[PDB]
Structures are given as structure tokens and as C-alpha cells.
Amino acid sequence: EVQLVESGGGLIQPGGSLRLSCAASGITVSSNYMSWVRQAPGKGLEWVSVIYAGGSTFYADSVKGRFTISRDNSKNTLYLQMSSLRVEDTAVYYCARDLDYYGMDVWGRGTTVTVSSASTKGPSVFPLAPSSKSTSGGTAALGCLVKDYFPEPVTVSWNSGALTSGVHTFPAVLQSSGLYSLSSVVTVPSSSLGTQTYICNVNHKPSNTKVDKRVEPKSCDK
Amino acid sequence: AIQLTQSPSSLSASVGDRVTITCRASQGISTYLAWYQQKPGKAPKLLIYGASTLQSGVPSRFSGSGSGTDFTLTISSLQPEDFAAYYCQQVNSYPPITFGPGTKVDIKRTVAAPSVFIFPPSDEQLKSGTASVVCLLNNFYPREAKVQWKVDNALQSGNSQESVTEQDSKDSTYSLSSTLTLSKADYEKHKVYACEVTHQGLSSPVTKSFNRGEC
């Protein structure tokens, strides 16, 4: 089946500018046409149209001059450029594969937009573990604490159990405050304590801090 | 443009429930009306061409109809995952495209009370002077499981916030996220803290306690 690759993250003051990229794969885009979509949580769902198949270009009335499209058929790459994002232009965006060209069929990876009065901030590392029963219990759930930070992306990694994709971590949800909060809970075998040194940290995306430390058991006897 | 509506805005169903929903507009849009489905965290799906034109990749359980000012949709088979919200939308050369209000179609099993779980609170909640009590609320349906916080099992006017989550067919139930803000003074006078739920599936008053030393 035909697939694409999307891209994009926008974090600017009101009136934001950026250029994007979205390239289909498996077939030349000369024959097939495809328009970007708005997938705003809370706000809802909006879309775009294309030229030479449906014709011209679909923007909102004020958005008409504030968003622009082009196309690179030989490269089979589609790009999106904005110059002045609106105050409520704060949303994630995908693109929707078209077969009959007025109905969406297949999506890519996404593109997010952020215009917030808050500035870059980073949380701390507060991992959690159950009590001393793990010495005999083969498996148990762990914990972590992350809250009150700047845009959702937080990545939690553990050096035991399944791969890095097994950590129960997702982007958070924004409210009027501007901060963000989530949690991390992971269940890994406890027999690796005597063979692999445990390491936990927060891989916060807009953090601008890189500190790595190891993890040791509770050691309540000390 | 034009206005548009659906009947109803939310319906409850069950496995195999042949759901019958309607979309009405004032002036008929001829053959180019397309209903749409929406799964949370998932891409929507174009559903029907014309009135009942079936396309590739979809099981034949669907049946769309309606004419003139009214259009309908009746789906012969309901596999349990068919829980979704559904949009209606026309097609025209007019670049603006209008979508009618959705119908939050539900799959109803019974009236079930929530479960109880707890994790220790984060360190920022202690430092800020706003003491907090955590109690993970899960596995309830229907949604209206009214949540109250009875400090020392004492009923109060408020002190409760809610942000309910979605169906997870792994358990066929809802779940809830809450927020509690209180002054530091109230923490010292009271000893043991717990949360209460008022749901229509309860046969007796319910209160829960647990050990901080547990894990």
C-alpha cells in the first residue's frame, strides 16, 4: 500500500513561521494528490485541498494569505510553509492519502503547532519502586514522577525488561495554566538487579539539560 | 452555507446492535453526502459513497439510506469495537466544507461501580503547601459516577474535579482523572484520607482504605 512520511514541530510567538515536509512513498506523486489536515485536540478537525485535482487551494479566509502550498513532483515531496500563525493556531496536523480525492484514506506521522506565553522549562527525575518484596517476586511495577513542565514530550527509559517502547509514557495534556504533567509506570523482571545496574532519567524534549545517574535499591537496613 | 444536524447526538448500543442513526439537512445535497466515523487516537474513515455505494476494505455490515431533507445510516452487524463518534459531511466544489454535529455512539454493558488504586503523590505537591491525596479511579460505566472527597469520611460541598477518559475495550469500561486542591492546614487535623464515588450501580455506601507501607 502507498505510504508517506510527514514532519514538523512549530513553537513560535503569535505570528509563527516555519516550513514543513511530507513525502509519499511507493508511488510517484505526479499521478496521486493529497492535502494536509488539521487534527486539533479539543478544537476538532480541519483539512486542506490541492490544485489540478479539485483545483486552486483551500485555506481559511484569514488563513488564505497566512498559509501557502507548493509541490515538488520529481522529488515526490510536499511541503507546507506558514509565516504568521494565529493566536489559536496551536494544533497537531497530519496529512490524508486520497484515492478518489475527496475522501481520506491513509495518514502519516504528524505535525504539531505551539504558540504559548510560557517559556522553555524542564522537570526533574523522581523514579519509584515497590517495597522489598521484589527480592523474591519475579516481576513488579515501578513508577516515576514528572509534572509542571513545558510542552508534553517526555521520554522515560529503563535498562531492564522489554525494549524502550514498553514504557507506559505518552504526551501530556495542556490546560489554561500552560504547564504539563504525566507519569511513568514500568514492569520489568527483578532478577536483573544483580546483573545490570539500573538507570532512570527523564528525556524531556524542550529541557536543555543532560544529566544521567544510576539507581540503587531502597536499602532500608542502612 | 447551510446548517446540519444528526438524530441523536449520542446513542448506547451493544454487540450486534443494529444501530439506526439519522442526519437531516434543510435542502437535499443530491447524491454527494458522506457520513464519517471517528475512533479516538485514530484516523477517521470515509464510510459511504452516494447513498449505499460500498467501497474496498470495509465489511458489508453497513446500510446507508435517506432522501431529500433526511438521510439515515443503519449498520446490520455491530462488532463491539464499533463504539465511536460519527460525523456527516457533504462534497461540493465550494472549498469550505461543513461537518454536522457528531453522534457519540456508545456500547452499553451494564451499570458498574469503579475500582480502587493508589500511587504515592509527587514531591511538588508536598513542597507547595497544597497537600494532595491520590486515589486512582478505574473500571466504571456508565460515565456518571459522581466523585466526592470525604476527608475522614466527612461529606463536603465540593473539593472534587473530573476529567473522564474513554472506552478501553480491554476492560469495556471508562476511567476518570481528578484534581484536588486543599490548604496545608486541613492536612494536620485529619488522619486518614480517601475518595468516594456516587454511582447508580451501587447497592450500599462504599468507603476504601489502604496502607501507605504497601509497596
Short mmCIF file of C-alpha atoms in Angstrom, two decimals:
data_model
loop_
_atom_site.label_atom_id
_atom_site.label_comp_id
_atom_site.label_asym_id
_atom_site.label_seq_id
_atom_site.Cartn_x
_atom_site.Cartn_y
_atom_site.Cartn_z
CA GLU A 1 0.00 0.00 0.00
CA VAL A 2 1.05 3.60 -0.59
CA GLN A 3 2.70 5.27 2.40
CA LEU A 4 4.08 8.71 3.27
CA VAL A 5 6.45 10.43 5.68
CA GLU A 6 5.43 13.64 7.45
CA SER A 7 7.37 16.09 9.61
CA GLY A 8 7.07 19.25 11.63
CA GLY A 9 7.01 20.96 15.01
CA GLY A 10 6.12 24.61 15.50
CA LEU A 11 6.88 26.59 18.67
CA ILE A 12 6.78 30.34 17.98
CA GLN A 13 5.28 33.52 19.45
CA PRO A 14 2.00 34.68 17.85
CA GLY A 15 2.62 35.12 14.14
CA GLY A 16 4.69 31.97 13.76
CA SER A 17 6.67 31.00 10.66
CA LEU A 18 8.02 27.60 9.59
CA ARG A 19 8.32 25.28 6.59
CA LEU A 20 7.28 21.63 6.59
CA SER A 21 7.75 18.43 4.59
CA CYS A 22 5.55 15.49 3.60
CA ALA A 23 6.64 12.92 1.02
CA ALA A 24 4.66 9.92 -0.18
CA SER A 25 6.37 6.58 -0.76
CA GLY A 26 5.82 3.67 -3.12
CA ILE A 27 4.33 5.70 -5.98
CA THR A 28 5.05 8.92 -7.86
CA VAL A 29 3.04 11.89 -6.59
CA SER A 30 2.54 13.11 -10.16
CA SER A 31 -0.48 10.84 -10.58
CA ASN A 32 -1.78 10.94 -6.99
CA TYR A 33 -2.68 14.02 -4.96
CA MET A 34 -3.04 14.59 -1.26
CA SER A 35 -3.71 17.51 1.10
CA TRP A 36 -2.72 18.34 4.67
CA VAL A 37 -5.22 18.05 7.52
CA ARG A 38 -5.82 19.71 10.88
CA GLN A 39 -6.33 17.28 13.78
CA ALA A 40 -6.61 19.71 16.68
CA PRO A 41 -7.44 18.05 20.01
CA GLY A 42 -10.36 19.85 21.60
CA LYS A 43 -10.80 22.29 18.72
CA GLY A 44 -11.64 19.49 16.28
CA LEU A 45 -10.75 18.59 12.70
CA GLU A 46 -9.94 20.71 9.65
CA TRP A 47 -8.42 19.97 6.27
CA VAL A 48 -6.81 21.33 3.08
CA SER A 49 -7.30 20.81 -0.67
CA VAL A 50 -4.98 20.70 -3.69
CA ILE A 51 -4.62 22.18 -7.16
CA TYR A 52 -5.01 20.44 -10.54
CA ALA A 53 -7.16 17.82 -8.77
CA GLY A 54 -10.03 19.75 -7.23
CA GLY A 55 -8.12 22.91 -8.16
CA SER A 56 -6.69 26.06 -6.55
CA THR A 57 -6.10 25.74 -2.78
CA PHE A 58 -8.25 25.55 0.35
CA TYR A 59 -7.34 27.90 3.18
CA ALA A 60 -9.48 29.72 5.69
CA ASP A 61 -10.36 33.30 4.79
CA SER A 62 -7.82 34.96 7.09
CA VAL A 63 -5.58 31.90 6.71
CA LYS A 64 -5.68 32.39 2.92
CA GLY A 65 -2.66 34.69 2.88
CA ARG A 66 -1.21 33.24 6.09
CA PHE A 67 -0.58 29.72 4.73
CA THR A 68 0.98 28.65 1.45
CA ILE A 69 1.48 25.45 -0.54
CA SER A 70 3.78 24.20 -3.30
CA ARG A 71 4.79 20.84 -4.74
CA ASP A 72 7.90 19.00 -5.96
CA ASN A 73 6.67 16.24 -8.27
CA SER A 74 10.08 14.87 -9.26
CA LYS A 75 11.19 14.72 -5.63
CA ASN A 76 7.71 13.38 -4.77
CA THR A 77 7.88 15.71 -1.75
CA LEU A 78 5.18 18.06 -0.45
CA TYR A 79 5.99 20.99 1.82
CA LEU A 80 3.88 23.38 3.89
CA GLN A 81 5.02 26.88 4.86
CA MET A 82 3.45 29.45 7.17
CA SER A 83 4.54 32.98 8.05
CA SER A 84 2.11 34.23 10.72
CA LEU A 85 0.25 31.65 12.80
CA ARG A 86 -2.89 32.90 14.52
CA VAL A 87 -3.34 33.06 18.30
CA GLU A 88 -5.42 29.86 18.26
CA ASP A 89 -3.12 28.28 15.64
CA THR A 90 -2.00 25.67 18.19
CA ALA A 91 -2.70 22.17 16.91
CA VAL A 92 -1.30 18.91 15.61
CA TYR A 93 -1.53 18.33 11.86
CA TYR A 94 -1.48 15.18 9.73
CA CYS A 95 -1.95 14.50 6.02
CA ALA A 96 -4.54 12.23 4.46
CA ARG A 97 -3.97 9.94 1.48
CA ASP A 98 -6.56 10.28 -1.28
CA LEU A 99 -7.73 7.65 -3.77
CA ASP A 100 -10.98 9.17 -5.04
CA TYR A 101 -9.51 12.54 -3.92
CA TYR A 102 -12.42 13.74 -1.79
CA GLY A 103 -12.09 11.14 0.97
CA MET A 104 -9.15 10.42 3.25
CA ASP A 105 -7.55 7.01 3.29
CA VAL A 106 -4.07 6.87 4.89
CA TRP A 107 -2.18 9.12 7.31
CA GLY A 108 1.44 9.90 8.12
CA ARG A 109 3.26 10.77 11.34
CA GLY A 110 2.06 14.29 12.22
CA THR A 111 2.96 17.94 12.66
CA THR A 112 2.31 19.98 15.80
CA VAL A 113 1.97 23.73 16.33
CA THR A 114 2.61 25.55 19.62
CA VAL A 115 2.06 29.22 20.46
CA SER A 116 2.21 29.66 24.24
CA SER A 117 3.09 32.52 26.57
CA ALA A 118 5.07 30.09 28.74
CA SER A 119 8.81 29.69 28.15
CA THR A 120 11.01 26.60 28.00
CA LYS A 121 11.07 24.58 31.22
CA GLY A 122 12.21 21.15 32.37
CA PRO A 123 11.07 18.75 35.09
CA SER A 124 13.10 16.53 37.41
CA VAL A 125 13.63 12.78 37.91
CA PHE A 126 11.66 11.03 40.67
CA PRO A 127 11.57 7.28 39.99
CA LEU A 128 9.55 4.90 42.15
CA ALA A 129 9.79 1.21 43.04
CA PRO A 130 7.73 -1.18 45.19
CA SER A 131 8.83 -2.43 48.61
CA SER A 132 11.41 -5.11 49.43
CA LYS A 133 9.19 -7.98 48.22
CA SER A 134 10.95 -7.79 44.84
CA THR A 135 13.77 -9.94 46.26
CA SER A 136 11.52 -12.98 45.76
CA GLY A 137 8.84 -11.64 43.42
CA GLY A 138 9.93 -12.12 39.82
CA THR A 139 8.10 -9.13 38.35
CA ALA A 140 6.54 -5.94 39.73
CA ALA A 141 5.57 -2.47 38.56
CA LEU A 142 7.76 0.62 39.04
CA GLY A 143 6.97 4.33 38.98
CA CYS A 144 8.16 7.80 38.04
CA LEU A 145 7.06 11.39 38.68
CA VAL A 146 7.11 14.17 36.06
CA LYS A 147 4.96 17.30 36.22
CA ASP A 148 4.73 21.07 35.68
CA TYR A 149 6.78 21.47 32.52
CA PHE A 150 6.82 22.97 29.05
CA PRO A 151 5.11 21.10 26.15
CA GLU A 152 4.06 17.45 26.53
CA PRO A 153 7.04 15.45 25.12
CA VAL A 154 8.61 13.46 27.95
CA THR A 155 10.53 10.22 27.36
CA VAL A 156 11.19 7.66 30.10
CA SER A 157 13.81 4.94 29.60
CA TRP A 158 14.68 1.88 31.68
CA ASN A 159 17.60 -0.52 31.19
CA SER A 160 15.67 -3.69 32.08
CA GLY A 161 12.73 -5.74 30.87
CA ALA A 162 11.34 -5.12 27.39
CA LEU A 163 12.59 -2.54 24.88
CA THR A 164 12.31 1.23 25.32
CA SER A 165 8.90 1.18 23.60
CA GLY A 166 7.38 -0.74 26.54
CA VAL A 167 7.46 2.20 28.96
CA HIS A 168 3.93 3.48 29.60
CA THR A 169 4.57 7.08 28.52
CA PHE A 170 2.57 9.42 26.29
CA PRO A 171 2.46 13.17 25.62
CA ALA A 172 0.57 15.04 28.33
CA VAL A 173 -2.46 17.36 28.10
CA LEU A 174 -2.46 21.16 28.27
CA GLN A 175 -4.76 23.32 30.38
CA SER A 176 -5.07 27.08 30.84
CA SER A 177 -2.08 27.18 33.20
CA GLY A 178 0.46 26.34 30.49
CA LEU A 179 2.21 23.55 32.41
CA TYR A 180 2.09 19.80 31.77
CA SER A 181 2.11 16.61 33.84
CA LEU A 182 2.23 12.85 33.31
CA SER A 183 3.50 9.68 34.98
CA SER A 184 5.58 6.62 34.14
CA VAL A 185 4.93 3.06 35.35
CA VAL A 186 7.01 0.13 34.10
CA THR A 187 7.04 -3.58 34.98
CA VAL A 188 10.38 -5.34 34.47
CA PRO A 189 11.86 -8.55 35.90
CA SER A 190 13.58 -8.03 39.25
CA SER A 191 16.29 -10.66 38.67
CA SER A 192 18.39 -8.13 36.72
CA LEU A 193 19.34 -6.20 39.89
CA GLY A 194 22.32 -8.48 40.50
CA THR A 195 23.46 -8.40 36.86
CA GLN A 196 22.65 -4.95 35.40
CA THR A 197 22.92 -1.58 37.13
CA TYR A 198 19.63 0.30 36.91
CA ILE A 199 19.48 3.76 35.31
CA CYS A 200 16.44 6.05 35.25
CA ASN A 201 16.01 9.59 33.94
CA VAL A 202 13.62 11.94 32.16
CA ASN A 203 14.29 12.56 28.47
CA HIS A 204 12.30 15.78 28.35
CA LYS A 205 12.36 17.25 24.84
CA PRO A 206 12.46 21.04 25.49
CA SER A 207 14.66 20.71 28.58
CA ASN A 208 18.17 21.82 27.53
CA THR A 209 19.63 19.64 30.29
CA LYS A 210 21.52 16.32 30.04
CA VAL A 211 22.33 14.62 33.36
CA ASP A 212 22.49 10.83 33.76
CA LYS A 213 22.56 9.00 37.10
CA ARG A 214 22.27 5.42 38.33
CA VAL A 215 19.62 3.79 40.53
CA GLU A 216 20.16 1.74 43.69
CA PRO A 217 17.69 -0.23 45.83
CA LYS A 218 15.92 1.25 48.83
CA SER A 219 18.39 -0.28 51.33
CA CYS A 220 16.17 0.36 54.35
CA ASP A 221 18.61 -1.60 56.54
CA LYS A 222 21.15 1.24 56.28
CA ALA B 1 -23.52 27.87 3.75
CA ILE B 2 -26.11 25.54 5.29
CA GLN B 3 -26.97 24.14 8.71
CA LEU B 4 -26.96 20.45 9.54
CA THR B 5 -27.91 18.13 12.39
CA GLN B 6 -27.99 14.46 13.38
CA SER B 7 -30.52 12.43 15.36
CA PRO B 8 -29.41 11.69 18.04
CA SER B 9 -26.21 13.26 19.40
CA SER B 10 -25.32 10.08 21.32
CA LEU B 11 -26.73 6.55 21.44
CA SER B 12 -25.97 3.45 23.51
CA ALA B 13 -25.73 0.05 21.82
CA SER B 14 -24.31 -3.44 22.30
CA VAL B 15 -22.52 -6.23 20.45
CA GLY B 16 -24.58 -6.86 17.32
CA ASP B 17 -26.88 -3.87 17.95
CA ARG B 18 -28.06 -2.79 14.50
CA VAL B 19 -27.67 0.93 15.15
CA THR B 20 -30.03 3.28 13.31
CA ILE B 21 -28.96 6.95 13.21
CA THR B 22 -30.22 9.84 11.10
CA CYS B 23 -28.80 13.01 9.54
CA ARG B 24 -31.15 15.78 8.38
CA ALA B 25 -30.47 18.88 6.29
CA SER B 26 -32.90 21.54 5.13
CA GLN B 27 -32.07 21.25 1.41
CA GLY B 28 -31.06 17.95 -0.20
CA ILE B 29 -27.42 17.65 -1.24
CA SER B 30 -28.38 15.25 -4.07
CA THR B 31 -26.00 12.24 -4.15
CA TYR B 32 -22.86 13.72 -2.55
CA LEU B 33 -23.44 13.21 1.17
CA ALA B 34 -20.80 11.21 3.05
CA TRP B 35 -21.10 10.05 6.63
CA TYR B 36 -17.90 9.54 8.61
CA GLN B 37 -16.76 7.65 11.70
CA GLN B 38 -14.23 8.69 14.33
CA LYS B 39 -12.17 6.49 16.64
CA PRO B 40 -10.23 8.35 19.35
CA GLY B 41 -6.49 8.38 18.82
CA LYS B 42 -7.15 7.01 15.32
CA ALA B 43 -7.69 8.39 11.85
CA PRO B 44 -11.35 8.83 10.83
CA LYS B 45 -12.83 6.78 8.00
CA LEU B 46 -14.83 7.77 4.96
CA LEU B 47 -17.76 5.40 5.08
CA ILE B 48 -20.25 5.62 2.20
CA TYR B 49 -20.32 6.81 -1.40
CA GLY B 50 -23.60 8.10 -2.77
CA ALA B 51 -26.32 6.59 -0.61
CA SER B 52 -25.18 2.96 -0.24
CA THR B 53 -22.15 2.54 -2.54
CA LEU B 54 -19.77 0.10 -0.84
CA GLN B 55 -16.00 0.51 -1.25
CA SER B 56 -12.91 -1.60 -0.62
CA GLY B 57 -11.65 -2.59 2.81
CA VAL B 58 -14.93 -2.39 4.77
CA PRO B 59 -17.19 -5.31 5.80
CA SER B 60 -20.65 -5.33 4.23
CA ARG B 61 -22.39 -4.79 7.60
CA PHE B 62 -23.29 -1.22 6.60
CA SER B 63 -26.51 0.06 5.04
CA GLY B 64 -26.99 3.77 4.32
CA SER B 65 -30.20 5.39 3.13
CA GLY B 66 -32.32 8.53 3.30
CA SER B 67 -33.52 11.05 0.74
CA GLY B 68 -34.34 14.70 0.26
CA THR B 69 -34.09 16.52 3.58
CA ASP B 70 -33.28 13.37 5.58
CA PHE B 71 -30.57 10.73 5.42
CA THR B 72 -30.03 7.70 7.63
CA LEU B 73 -27.50 5.00 8.43
CA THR B 74 -28.23 1.51 9.75
CA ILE B 75 -25.43 -1.00 10.31
CA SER B 76 -26.51 -4.64 10.22
CA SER B 77 -23.74 -6.01 12.45
CA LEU B 78 -22.11 -4.40 15.49
CA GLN B 79 -18.78 -5.83 16.49
CA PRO B 80 -18.05 -4.45 19.97
CA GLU B 81 -15.31 -2.05 18.84
CA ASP B 82 -17.90 -0.10 16.79
CA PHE B 83 -18.00 2.31 19.74
CA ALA B 84 -17.22 5.63 18.07
CA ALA B 85 -18.44 9.11 17.22
CA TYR B 86 -19.77 9.77 13.74
CA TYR B 87 -19.75 12.87 11.51
CA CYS B 88 -21.79 13.85 8.46
CA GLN B 89 -20.36 15.98 5.68
CA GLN B 90 -21.18 16.87 2.08
CA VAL B 91 -19.00 17.30 -1.01
CA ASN B 92 -19.07 20.27 -3.39
CA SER B 93 -16.72 22.46 -5.43
CA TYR B 94 -17.24 25.13 -2.73
CA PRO B 95 -13.86 24.96 -0.92
CA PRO B 96 -15.43 25.38 2.55
CA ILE B 97 -16.72 22.02 3.78
CA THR B 98 -19.21 21.80 6.65
CA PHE B 99 -19.44 18.94 9.15
CA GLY B 100 -22.56 18.28 11.20
CA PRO B 101 -22.50 17.61 14.94
CA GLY B 102 -21.41 14.12 15.87
CA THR B 103 -23.33 11.27 17.47
CA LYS B 104 -21.38 9.74 20.35
CA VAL B 105 -22.44 6.14 19.74
CA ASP B 106 -21.99 4.04 22.88
CA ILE B 107 -21.76 0.33 23.63
CA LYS B 108 -23.58 -0.35 26.90
CA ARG B 109 -22.95 -3.46 29.02
CA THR B 110 -24.39 -2.67 32.47
CA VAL B 111 -24.18 -0.17 35.35
CA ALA B 112 -20.85 -0.84 37.06
CA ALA B 113 -19.07 0.79 40.02
CA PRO B 114 -15.41 1.89 39.79
CA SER B 115 -12.37 0.13 41.21
CA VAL B 116 -9.71 1.44 43.62
CA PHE B 117 -5.99 2.03 43.10
CA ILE B 118 -3.40 4.38 44.59
CA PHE B 119 0.12 5.67 43.84
CA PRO B 120 2.17 7.97 46.08
CA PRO B 121 1.92 11.64 45.13
CA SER B 122 4.73 13.59 43.51
CA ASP B 123 7.19 15.65 45.54
CA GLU B 124 5.99 19.03 44.22
CA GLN B 125 2.59 18.61 45.88
CA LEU B 126 4.14 18.44 49.36
CA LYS B 127 6.54 21.34 48.77
CA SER B 128 3.89 23.81 47.58
CA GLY B 129 1.81 23.69 50.76
CA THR B 130 -1.11 22.17 48.82
CA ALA B 131 -1.46 18.71 50.33
CA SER B 132 -2.99 16.16 47.97
CA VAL B 133 -4.41 12.65 48.26
CA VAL B 134 -4.12 10.28 45.29
CA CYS B 135 -6.63 7.53 44.51
CA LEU B 136 -6.61 6.03 41.02
CA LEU B 137 -10.21 5.57 39.84
CA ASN B 138 -10.76 2.96 37.12
CA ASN B 139 -13.20 0.43 35.68
CA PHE B 140 -16.62 2.08 35.83
CA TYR B 141 -19.52 2.55 33.41
CA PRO B 142 -21.74 4.46 32.67
CA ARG B 143 -19.81 7.72 32.84
CA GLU B 144 -21.82 9.47 35.57
CA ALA B 145 -20.00 8.00 38.57
CA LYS B 146 -20.21 11.11 40.73
CA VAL B 147 -16.96 11.53 42.68
CA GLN B 148 -16.70 13.15 46.11
CA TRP B 149 -13.84 13.50 48.59
CA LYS B 150 -14.80 12.61 52.17
CA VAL B 151 -11.87 13.56 54.39
CA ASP B 152 -12.17 11.33 57.46
CA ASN B 153 -15.34 10.11 55.71
CA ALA B 154 -16.90 13.57 56.09
CA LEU B 155 -19.14 14.85 53.30
CA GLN B 156 -18.38 18.34 51.98
CA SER B 157 -19.92 20.67 49.42
CA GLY B 158 -17.12 20.41 46.87
CA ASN B 159 -13.39 19.66 46.61
CA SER B 160 -13.64 17.47 43.51
CA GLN B 161 -12.59 17.84 39.86
CA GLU B 162 -13.17 15.43 36.99
CA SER B 163 -11.81 14.72 33.50
CA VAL B 164 -13.20 11.38 32.33
CA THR B 165 -11.29 9.17 29.89
CA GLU B 166 -12.55 6.95 27.06
CA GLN B 167 -13.58 3.34 26.48
CA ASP B 168 -10.80 0.76 26.63
CA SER B 169 -12.27 -2.43 25.18
CA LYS B 170 -9.60 -4.39 27.05
CA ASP B 171 -11.93 -3.84 30.02
CA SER B 172 -15.06 -2.42 28.31
CA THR B 173 -15.22 0.39 30.85
CA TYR B 174 -14.48 4.06 31.40
CA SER B 175 -11.91 5.67 33.70
CA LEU B 176 -11.60 9.04 35.40
CA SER B 177 -8.92 11.64 36.12
CA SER B 178 -9.38 14.05 39.02
CA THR B 179 -7.81 17.08 40.68
CA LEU B 180 -7.88 18.11 44.35
CA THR B 181 -6.58 21.36 45.86
CA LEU B 182 -6.56 21.99 49.60
CA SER B 183 -4.72 24.14 52.12
CA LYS B 184 -1.91 22.82 54.30
CA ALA B 185 -3.98 23.40 57.45
CA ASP B 186 -6.53 20.68 56.66
CA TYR B 187 -3.82 18.01 56.42
CA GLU B 188 -2.79 18.14 60.09
CA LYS B 189 -6.22 17.93 61.74
CA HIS B 190 -7.23 14.82 59.78
CA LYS B 191 -5.52 11.42 59.80
CA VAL B 192 -6.66 9.06 57.01
CA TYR B 193 -7.80 10.30 53.61
CA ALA B 194 -9.88 8.60 50.92
CA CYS B 195 -12.14 9.34 47.97
CA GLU B 196 -15.79 8.41 47.42
CA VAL B 197 -17.81 7.66 44.28
CA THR B 198 -21.59 8.06 43.89
CA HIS B 199 -22.63 5.76 41.04
CA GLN B 200 -26.04 4.41 40.04
CA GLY B 201 -24.63 0.86 40.22
CA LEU B 202 -24.03 0.91 43.99
CA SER B 203 -26.22 -1.13 46.34
CA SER B 204 -24.70 0.20 49.58
CA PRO B 205 -22.44 3.04 50.78
CA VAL B 206 -18.78 2.44 49.93
CA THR B 207 -15.55 3.67 51.51
CA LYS B 208 -11.99 2.44 50.96
CA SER B 209 -8.75 2.44 52.94
CA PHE B 210 -5.26 1.15 52.26
CA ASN B 211 -1.74 1.12 53.68
CA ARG B 212 0.94 3.65 52.76
CA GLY B 213 3.54 0.99 53.56
CA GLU B 214 2.03 -1.30 50.92
CA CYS B 215 4.62 -1.01 48.12
#
